[PDB]
């Protein structure tokens, strides 16, 4: 724990926790490929349980990075192709608006306006078929980007079908295990409950509620140690022994579309380093992050650019997370909190910290 890291982290995080009234928080700073941990406050205010390196946090949308990579792994295995139409893996989708909508589109939120949230009323697998069949695009495929759980979530569900495995089983076997993320779960087992932090929303303790496509779009829980390890894997996919997993990771960082100065990958979103902090900070605000925007296809997709600021925000009703790394610098950071505080404040803290380290 070099004093340099120690100092920036505390100079930055301390005012952050106090300004946003964050109950508990864990931070991992990956400097030169090595992880450094810091923890603050409570995992459970009522039971006086402190946040520790073993505490599980709801990752929220950061879960999409795992989905993008698992999907990339499927492509690498030859099981699916991003150019394949959605209907090849779901022949039941017969509504004409699906012609021309590929897995690339679902994966990158460019199908033409799929909503951010899957309606609450959608429960059964037939309830989901009905939803997609009736959904009407506001735009032609591959022309507009609208960040949505219903889009990349569907991608994740379809991507694992050829494997014959269930989404959780596929995730575990192909991503969590190889990478030794042994305290990362889609479903927290009873044995681990004691490490599961409570999220906080307006003073009330809450955990994520079951929902359609939840596992695929925002349902992973993890500890600061595993997330640090997840960052290390996306920083250096070459150190990864499983051939298809290594490719998948790289495929998740390929640049498929560009909007503003941001490029869409599979789950991960990227910008060229050096970046203008104002651009990632203001751009992380939902004002922009959830807004519908025109996208320029990158034909063909640019392979993962090492000099990139790669990141993803994440949130549930009671949690707020952020992951950002610069491959070229072997530099990264993970910020986990059991409070959904504003994205801009997250990115600003990560920026000050990482910028201070090169
Ligand atoms: B991801 O975290 O970017 C997607 N997030 C969500 O789907 C959830 N909340 O995001 C919104 C609704 C924009 C918010 O209020 O911040 C979400 C999933 S489960 C849950 N309770 N909230």
GROMACS .gro file of C-alpha atoms and ligand atoms in nm:
model
  380
    1UNK     CA    1   0.000   0.000   0.000
    2UNK     CA    2   0.232   0.282  -0.125
    3UNK     CA    3   0.154   0.607   0.055
    4UNK     CA    4   0.093   0.767  -0.284
    5UNK     CA    5  -0.208   0.543  -0.355
    6UNK     CA    6  -0.321   0.559   0.009
    7UNK     CA    7  -0.325   0.938   0.001
    8UNK     CA    8  -0.511   0.995  -0.324
    9UNK     CA    9  -0.771   0.731  -0.238
   10UNK     CA   10  -0.848   0.886   0.103
   11UNK     CA   11  -0.819   1.248  -0.018
   12UNK     CA   12  -1.081   1.156  -0.280
   13UNK     CA   13  -1.314   0.898  -0.120
   14UNK     CA   14  -1.354   1.059   0.224
   15UNK     CA   15  -1.529   1.376   0.101
   16UNK     CA   16  -1.725   1.154  -0.137
   17UNK     CA   17  -1.877   0.934   0.134
   18UNK     CA   18  -1.964   1.236   0.347
   19UNK     CA   19  -2.115   1.438   0.060
   20UNK     CA   20  -2.325   1.149  -0.074
   21UNK     CA   21  -2.391   1.000   0.271
   22UNK     CA   22  -2.278   0.659   0.150
   23UNK     CA   23  -2.332   0.401   0.432
   24UNK     CA   24  -2.064   0.158   0.322
   25UNK     CA   25  -1.806   0.137   0.047
   26UNK     CA   26  -1.517  -0.069  -0.088
   27UNK     CA   27  -1.250   0.045  -0.334
   28UNK     CA   28  -0.986  -0.151  -0.522
   29UNK     CA   29  -0.708   0.029  -0.702
   30UNK     CA   30  -0.513  -0.187  -0.946
   31UNK     CA   31  -0.173  -0.019  -0.978
   32UNK     CA   32   0.078  -0.186  -1.210
   33UNK     CA   33  -0.130  -0.502  -1.212
   34UNK     CA   34  -0.141  -0.535  -0.831
   35UNK     CA   35  -0.457  -0.472  -0.625
   36UNK     CA   36  -0.492  -0.241  -0.327
   37UNK     CA   37  -0.800  -0.240  -0.103
   38UNK     CA   38  -0.979   0.012   0.114
   39UNK     CA   39  -1.308  -0.017   0.296
   40UNK     CA   40  -1.537   0.225   0.476
   41UNK     CA   41  -1.852   0.221   0.685
   42UNK     CA   42  -2.128  -0.039   0.704
   43UNK     CA   43  -2.259  -0.337   0.509
   44UNK     CA   44  -2.555  -0.361   0.749
   45UNK     CA   45  -2.629  -0.054   0.963
   46UNK     CA   46  -2.877  -0.232   1.190
   47UNK     CA   47  -2.651  -0.529   1.276
   48UNK     CA   48  -2.338  -0.309   1.292
   49UNK     CA   49  -2.160  -0.520   1.027
   50UNK     CA   50  -1.868  -0.330   0.867
   51UNK     CA   51  -1.778  -0.342   0.499
   52UNK     CA   52  -1.480  -0.577   0.448
   53UNK     CA   53  -1.298  -0.728   0.149
   54UNK     CA   54  -1.537  -1.025   0.174
   55UNK     CA   55  -1.854  -0.815   0.157
   56UNK     CA   56  -2.083  -0.881  -0.139
   57UNK     CA   57  -2.234  -0.585  -0.323
   58UNK     CA   58  -2.503  -0.584  -0.591
   59UNK     CA   59  -2.308  -0.490  -0.905
   60UNK     CA   60  -2.611  -0.361  -1.090
   61UNK     CA   61  -2.537  -0.294  -1.455
   62UNK     CA   62  -2.165  -0.377  -1.416
   63UNK     CA   63  -2.315  -0.724  -1.462
   64UNK     CA   64  -2.336  -0.634  -1.831
   65UNK     CA   65  -1.956  -0.663  -1.857
   66UNK     CA   66  -1.984  -1.027  -1.754
   67UNK     CA   67  -2.266  -1.072  -2.002
   68UNK     CA   68  -2.073  -0.907  -2.285
   69UNK     CA   69  -1.766  -1.125  -2.212
   70UNK     CA   70  -1.973  -1.446  -2.177
   71UNK     CA   71  -2.132  -1.358  -2.509
   72UNK     CA   72  -1.789  -1.290  -2.656
   73UNK     CA   73  -1.680  -1.627  -2.528
   74UNK     CA   74  -1.978  -1.784  -2.711
   75UNK     CA   75  -1.871  -1.611  -3.035
   76UNK     CA   76  -1.513  -1.726  -2.983
   77UNK     CA   77  -1.645  -2.082  -2.936
   78UNK     CA   78  -1.827  -2.060  -3.270
   79UNK     CA   79  -2.167  -2.111  -3.104
   80UNK     CA   80  -2.308  -1.774  -3.215
   81UNK     CA   81  -2.223  -1.486  -3.451
   82UNK     CA   82  -2.296  -1.118  -3.391
   83UNK     CA   83  -2.410  -1.101  -3.751
   84UNK     CA   84  -2.675  -1.373  -3.689
   85UNK     CA   85  -3.034  -1.252  -3.686
   86UNK     CA   86  -3.213  -1.259  -3.353
   87UNK     CA   87  -3.469  -1.502  -3.495
   88UNK     CA   88  -3.213  -1.777  -3.547
   89UNK     CA   89  -3.196  -1.836  -3.171
   90UNK     CA   90  -3.562  -1.754  -3.112
   91UNK     CA   91  -3.760  -1.881  -3.413
   92UNK     CA   92  -4.072  -1.803  -3.214
   93UNK     CA   93  -4.011  -1.431  -3.276
   94UNK     CA   94  -4.217  -1.405  -3.593
   95UNK     CA   95  -4.329  -1.039  -3.586
   96UNK     CA   96  -4.196  -0.859  -3.894
   97UNK     CA   97  -4.017  -0.584  -3.700
   98UNK     CA   98  -3.748  -0.839  -3.612
   99UNK     CA   99  -3.622  -0.881  -3.968
  100UNK     CA  100  -3.278  -0.727  -3.976
  101UNK     CA  101  -3.230  -0.716  -3.597
  102UNK     CA  102  -2.909  -0.906  -3.520
  103UNK     CA  103  -2.740  -1.020  -3.198
  104UNK     CA  104  -2.498  -0.730  -3.247
  105UNK     CA  105  -2.793  -0.495  -3.220
  106UNK     CA  106  -2.934  -0.645  -2.896
  107UNK     CA  107  -2.591  -0.659  -2.743
  108UNK     CA  108  -2.518  -0.291  -2.819
  109UNK     CA  109  -2.860  -0.130  -2.760
  110UNK     CA  110  -2.911  -0.052  -3.130
  111UNK     CA  111  -3.213  -0.269  -3.217
  112UNK     CA  112  -3.417   0.043  -3.264
  113UNK     CA  113  -3.557   0.151  -2.931
  114UNK     CA  114  -3.597  -0.147  -2.696
  115UNK     CA  115  -3.700  -0.001  -2.359
  116UNK     CA  116  -3.456   0.038  -2.069
  117UNK     CA  117  -3.681  -0.162  -1.844
  118UNK     CA  118  -3.864  -0.483  -1.917
  119UNK     CA  119  -4.220  -0.416  -1.796
  120UNK     CA  120  -4.293  -0.540  -1.444
  121UNK     CA  121  -4.589  -0.735  -1.586
  122UNK     CA  122  -4.350  -0.959  -1.777
  123UNK     CA  123  -4.290  -1.278  -1.580
  124UNK     CA  124  -4.321  -1.605  -1.769
  125UNK     CA  125  -4.112  -1.704  -2.066
  126UNK     CA  126  -4.427  -1.660  -2.279
  127UNK     CA  127  -4.482  -1.318  -2.116
  128UNK     CA  128  -4.143  -1.227  -2.255
  129UNK     CA  129  -4.215  -1.365  -2.603
  130UNK     CA  130  -4.533  -1.157  -2.609
  131UNK     CA  131  -4.346  -0.844  -2.504
  132UNK     CA  132  -4.088  -0.869  -2.783
  133UNK     CA  133  -4.344  -0.971  -3.046
  134UNK     CA  134  -4.557  -0.663  -2.966
  135UNK     CA  135  -4.268  -0.419  -2.921
  136UNK     CA  136  -4.258  -0.152  -3.193
  137UNK     CA  137  -3.923   0.000  -3.295
  138UNK     CA  138  -3.904   0.377  -3.306
  139UNK     CA  139  -3.600   0.353  -3.535
  140UNK     CA  140  -3.450   0.133  -3.803
  141UNK     CA  141  -3.196  -0.121  -3.674
  142UNK     CA  142  -2.840   0.005  -3.628
  143UNK     CA  143  -2.922   0.373  -3.635
  144UNK     CA  144  -2.992   0.476  -3.278
  145UNK     CA  145  -2.851   0.379  -2.936
  146UNK     CA  146  -3.085   0.349  -2.637
  147UNK     CA  147  -2.926   0.191  -2.331
  148UNK     CA  148  -3.154  -0.091  -2.224
  149UNK     CA  149  -3.179  -0.396  -2.003
  150UNK     CA  150  -3.434  -0.546  -2.246
  151UNK     CA  151  -3.180  -0.531  -2.526
  152UNK     CA  152  -2.852  -0.666  -2.383
  153UNK     CA  153  -3.047  -0.885  -2.146
  154UNK     CA  154  -3.207  -1.064  -2.441
  155UNK     CA  155  -2.866  -1.094  -2.604
  156UNK     CA  156  -2.731  -1.273  -2.297
  157UNK     CA  157  -3.029  -1.510  -2.285
  158UNK     CA  158  -2.997  -1.601  -2.651
  159UNK     CA  159  -2.618  -1.619  -2.655
  160UNK     CA  160  -2.604  -1.923  -2.424
  161UNK     CA  161  -2.876  -2.127  -2.597
  162UNK     CA  162  -2.652  -2.325  -2.831
  163UNK     CA  163  -2.440  -2.427  -2.529
  164UNK     CA  164  -2.752  -2.589  -2.387
  165UNK     CA  165  -2.657  -2.447  -2.050
  166UNK     CA  166  -2.865  -2.211  -1.839
  167UNK     CA  167  -2.738  -1.855  -1.821
  168UNK     CA  168  -2.612  -1.894  -1.460
  169UNK     CA  169  -2.450  -2.231  -1.528
  170UNK     CA  170  -2.282  -2.091  -1.843
  171UNK     CA  171  -2.159  -1.783  -1.655
  172UNK     CA  172  -2.016  -1.992  -1.372
  173UNK     CA  173  -1.850  -2.256  -1.583
  174UNK     CA  174  -1.715  -2.030  -1.854
  175UNK     CA  175  -1.636  -1.706  -1.675
  176UNK     CA  176  -1.647  -1.714  -1.291
  177UNK     CA  177  -1.458  -2.041  -1.238
  178UNK     CA  178  -1.173  -2.001  -1.491
  179UNK     CA  179  -1.103  -1.657  -1.343
  180UNK     CA  180  -1.134  -1.783  -0.985
  181UNK     CA  181  -1.414  -1.540  -0.903
  182UNK     CA  182  -1.531  -1.770  -0.622
  183UNK     CA  183  -1.735  -1.509  -0.437
  184UNK     CA  184  -1.927  -1.377  -0.733
  185UNK     CA  185  -2.289  -1.491  -0.768
  186UNK     CA  186  -2.603  -1.444  -0.971
  187UNK     CA  187  -2.778  -1.608  -0.671
  188UNK     CA  188  -2.621  -1.557  -0.329
  189UNK     CA  189  -2.609  -1.898  -0.159
  190UNK     CA  190  -2.731  -1.930   0.205
  191UNK     CA  191  -2.371  -1.995   0.312
  192UNK     CA  192  -2.273  -1.649   0.184
  193UNK     CA  193  -2.566  -1.447   0.316
  194UNK     CA  194  -2.361  -1.325   0.611
  195UNK     CA  195  -2.137  -1.129   0.366
  196UNK     CA  196  -2.426  -0.987   0.162
  197UNK     CA  197  -2.449  -0.616   0.231
  198UNK     CA  198  -2.787  -0.444   0.250
  199UNK     CA  199  -2.843  -0.172  -0.007
  200UNK     CA  200  -2.986   0.157   0.114
  201UNK     CA  201  -3.253   0.372  -0.047
  202UNK     CA  202  -3.376   0.671   0.149
  203UNK     CA  203  -3.277   0.507   0.478
  204UNK     CA  204  -3.444   0.174   0.402
  205UNK     CA  205  -3.244  -0.147   0.367
  206UNK     CA  206  -3.314  -0.327   0.040
  207UNK     CA  207  -3.190  -0.604  -0.183
  208UNK     CA  208  -3.261  -0.646  -0.553
  209UNK     CA  209  -3.605  -0.793  -0.641
  210UNK     CA  210  -3.644  -1.076  -0.896
  211UNK     CA  211  -3.729  -0.949  -1.245
  212UNK     CA  212  -3.725  -1.059  -1.607
  213UNK     CA  213  -3.377  -1.079  -1.758
  214UNK     CA  214  -3.235  -0.970  -1.424
  215UNK     CA  215  -2.937  -1.211  -1.422
  216UNK     CA  216  -2.834  -1.108  -1.773
  217UNK     CA  217  -2.869  -0.732  -1.724
  218UNK     CA  218  -2.796  -0.638  -1.362
  219UNK     CA  219  -2.803  -0.938  -1.129
  220UNK     CA  220  -2.445  -1.021  -1.027
  221UNK     CA  221  -2.319  -0.969  -0.670
  222UNK     CA  222  -1.945  -0.971  -0.596
  223UNK     CA  223  -1.679  -0.871  -0.343
  224UNK     CA  224  -1.412  -0.605  -0.385
  225UNK     CA  225  -1.148  -0.879  -0.415
  226UNK     CA  226  -1.323  -1.056  -0.702
  227UNK     CA  227  -1.399  -0.731  -0.883
  228UNK     CA  228  -1.030  -0.638  -0.858
  229UNK     CA  229  -0.957  -0.974  -1.014
  230UNK     CA  230  -1.221  -0.907  -1.283
  231UNK     CA  231  -1.047  -0.578  -1.369
  232UNK     CA  232  -0.709  -0.755  -1.385
  233UNK     CA  233  -0.858  -0.998  -1.639
  234UNK     CA  234  -0.995  -0.728  -1.867
  235UNK     CA  235  -0.667  -0.536  -1.839
  236UNK     CA  236  -0.459  -0.837  -1.955
  237UNK     CA  237  -0.677  -1.095  -2.132
  238UNK     CA  238  -0.361  -1.259  -2.265
  239UNK     CA  239  -0.267  -1.396  -1.923
  240UNK     CA  240  -0.590  -1.598  -1.944
  241UNK     CA  241  -0.534  -1.967  -2.024
  242UNK     CA  242  -0.874  -2.055  -2.167
  243UNK     CA  243  -0.850  -1.968  -2.535
  244UNK     CA  244  -1.216  -1.879  -2.596
  245UNK     CA  245  -1.243  -1.680  -2.275
  246UNK     CA  246  -0.936  -1.476  -2.372
  247UNK     CA  247  -1.094  -1.396  -2.709
  248UNK     CA  248  -1.430  -1.311  -2.557
  249UNK     CA  249  -1.276  -1.052  -2.327
  250UNK     CA  250  -1.103  -0.890  -2.623
  251UNK     CA  251  -1.425  -0.902  -2.822
  252UNK     CA  252  -1.607  -0.719  -2.539
  253UNK     CA  253  -1.359  -0.434  -2.580
  254UNK     CA  254  -1.385  -0.409  -2.960
  255UNK     CA  255  -1.547  -0.085  -3.081
  256UNK     CA  256  -1.875  -0.150  -3.261
  257UNK     CA  257  -2.035   0.195  -3.265
  258UNK     CA  258  -1.954   0.551  -3.177
  259UNK     CA  259  -2.178   0.820  -3.025
  260UNK     CA  260  -2.028   1.146  -2.909
  261UNK     CA  261  -1.673   1.052  -2.814
  262UNK     CA  262  -1.777   0.717  -2.666
  263UNK     CA  263  -1.751   0.374  -2.832
  264UNK     CA  264  -1.982   0.084  -2.751
  265UNK     CA  265  -1.839  -0.259  -2.679
  266UNK     CA  266  -2.008  -0.572  -2.542
  267UNK     CA  267  -2.110  -0.446  -2.198
  268UNK     CA  268  -1.801  -0.226  -2.161
  269UNK     CA  269  -1.804   0.125  -2.307
  270UNK     CA  270  -1.476   0.288  -2.414
  271UNK     CA  271  -1.315   0.628  -2.493
  272UNK     CA  272  -0.962   0.702  -2.619
  273UNK     CA  273  -0.707   0.778  -2.349
  274UNK     CA  274  -0.618   1.047  -2.266
  275UNK     CA  275  -0.975   1.157  -2.208
  276UNK     CA  276  -1.129   1.486  -2.113
  277UNK     CA  277  -1.263   1.421  -1.761
  278UNK     CA  278  -1.559   1.653  -1.828
  279UNK     CA  279  -1.654   1.423  -2.113
  280UNK     CA  280  -1.675   1.100  -1.910
  281UNK     CA  281  -1.803   1.277  -1.600
  282UNK     CA  282  -2.093   1.467  -1.762
  283UNK     CA  283  -2.146   1.181  -2.005
  284UNK     CA  284  -2.202   0.937  -1.721
  285UNK     CA  285  -2.502   1.142  -1.604
  286UNK     CA  286  -2.826   0.965  -1.689
  287UNK     CA  287  -2.927   1.289  -1.868
  288UNK     CA  288  -2.696   1.156  -2.141
  289UNK     CA  289  -2.628   0.790  -2.059
  290UNK     CA  290  -2.993   0.690  -2.092
  291UNK     CA  291  -3.078   0.933  -2.377
  292UNK     CA  292  -3.148   0.808  -2.729
  293UNK     CA  293  -2.858   0.904  -2.960
  294UNK     CA  294  -2.748   0.854  -3.325
  295UNK     CA  295  -2.460   0.608  -3.365
  296UNK     CA  296  -2.198   0.570  -3.635
  297UNK     CA  297  -2.130   0.210  -3.725
  298UNK     CA  298  -1.760   0.124  -3.707
  299UNK     CA  299  -1.717  -0.091  -4.016
  300UNK     CA  300  -1.552  -0.321  -3.936
  301UNK     CA  301  -1.519  -0.305  -3.555
  302UNK     CA  302  -1.182  -0.177  -3.423
  303UNK     CA  303  -1.007  -0.438  -3.203
  304UNK     CA  304  -0.957  -0.346  -2.838
  305UNK     CA  305  -0.745  -0.029  -2.819
  306UNK     CA  306  -0.500  -0.052  -2.527
  307UNK     CA  307  -0.491   0.327  -2.486
  308UNK     CA  308  -0.854   0.342  -2.375
  309UNK     CA  309  -1.044   0.442  -2.069
  310UNK     CA  310  -1.273   0.134  -2.041
  311UNK     CA  311  -1.561   0.151  -1.794
  312UNK     CA  312  -1.915   0.086  -1.679
  313UNK     CA  313  -2.148   0.233  -1.421
  314UNK     CA  314  -2.385   0.007  -1.227
  315UNK     CA  315  -2.685   0.049  -0.999
  316UNK     CA  316  -2.982  -0.115  -0.831
  317UNK     CA  317  -3.228   0.049  -0.595
  318UNK     CA  318  -2.983   0.031  -0.305
  319UNK     CA  319  -2.640   0.004  -0.470
  320UNK     CA  320  -2.407   0.209  -0.690
  321UNK     CA  321  -2.096   0.069  -0.852
  322UNK     CA  322  -1.832   0.176  -1.105
  323UNK     CA  323  -1.545   0.002  -1.280
  324UNK     CA  324  -1.287   0.177  -1.498
  325UNK     CA  325  -0.946   0.075  -1.631
  326UNK     CA  326  -0.671   0.177  -1.875
  327UNK     CA  327  -0.515  -0.132  -2.035
  328UNK     CA  328  -0.206   0.049  -2.159
  329UNK     CA  329  -0.126   0.175  -1.809
  330UNK     CA  330  -0.211  -0.148  -1.622
  331UNK     CA  331  -0.425   0.087  -1.416
  332UNK     CA  332  -0.778   0.036  -1.287
  333UNK     CA  333  -1.027   0.101  -1.009
  334UNK     CA  334  -1.345  -0.058  -0.863
  335UNK     CA  335  -1.590   0.146  -0.650
  336UNK     CA  336  -1.865  -0.045  -0.465
  337UNK     CA  337  -2.127   0.124  -0.248
  338UNK     CA  338  -2.453   0.020  -0.084
  339UNK     CA  339  -2.623   0.339  -0.195
  340UNK     CA  340  -2.719   0.448  -0.545
  341UNK     CA  341  -2.547   0.788  -0.556
  342UNK     CA  342  -2.510   0.996  -0.880
  343UNK     CA  343  -2.296   0.850  -1.160
  344UNK     CA  344  -2.108   1.182  -1.218
  345UNK     CA  345  -1.977   1.185  -0.862
  346UNK     CA  346  -1.857   0.823  -0.912
  347UNK     CA  347  -1.662   0.896  -1.232
  348UNK     CA  348  -1.521   1.220  -1.091
  349UNK     CA  349  -1.374   1.030  -0.793
  350UNK     CA  350  -1.237   0.756  -1.016
  351UNK     CA  351  -1.087   1.019  -1.247
  352UNK     CA  352  -0.908   1.218  -0.977
  353UNK     CA  353  -0.767   0.890  -0.840
  354UNK     CA  354  -0.654   0.736  -1.165
  355UNK     CA  355  -0.527   1.061  -1.321
  356UNK     CA  356  -0.314   1.112  -1.009
  357UNK     CA  357  -0.148   0.777  -1.077
  358UNK     CA  358  -0.035   0.858  -1.437
  359LIG     B1  359  -2.782  -0.044  -1.495
  359LIG     O1  360  -2.751  -0.038  -1.350
  359LIG     O2  361  -2.733   0.078  -1.561
  359LIG     C1  362  -2.936  -0.057  -1.516
  359LIG     N1  363  -3.005  -0.022  -1.391
  359LIG     C2  364  -3.129  -0.062  -1.365
  359LIG     O3  365  -3.192  -0.132  -1.446
  359LIG     C3  366  -3.191  -0.024  -1.240
  359LIG     N2  367  -3.208   0.105  -1.198
  359LIG     O4  368  -3.165   0.209  -1.295
  359LIG     C4  369  -3.254   0.323  -1.292
  359LIG     C5  370  -3.402   0.277  -1.303
  359LIG     C6  371  -3.223   0.412  -1.416
  359LIG     C7  372  -3.231   0.407  -1.164
  359LIG     O5  373  -3.332   0.442  -1.095
  359LIG     O6  374  -3.111   0.440  -1.134
  359LIG     C8  375  -3.244  -0.122  -1.141
  359LIG     C9  376  -3.236  -0.265  -1.153
  359LIG     S1  377  -3.306  -0.347  -1.024
  359LIG    C10  378  -3.349  -0.202  -0.950
  359LIG     N3  379  -3.416  -0.192  -0.828
  359LIG     N4  380  -3.310  -0.097  -1.022
   0.00000   0.00000   0.00000
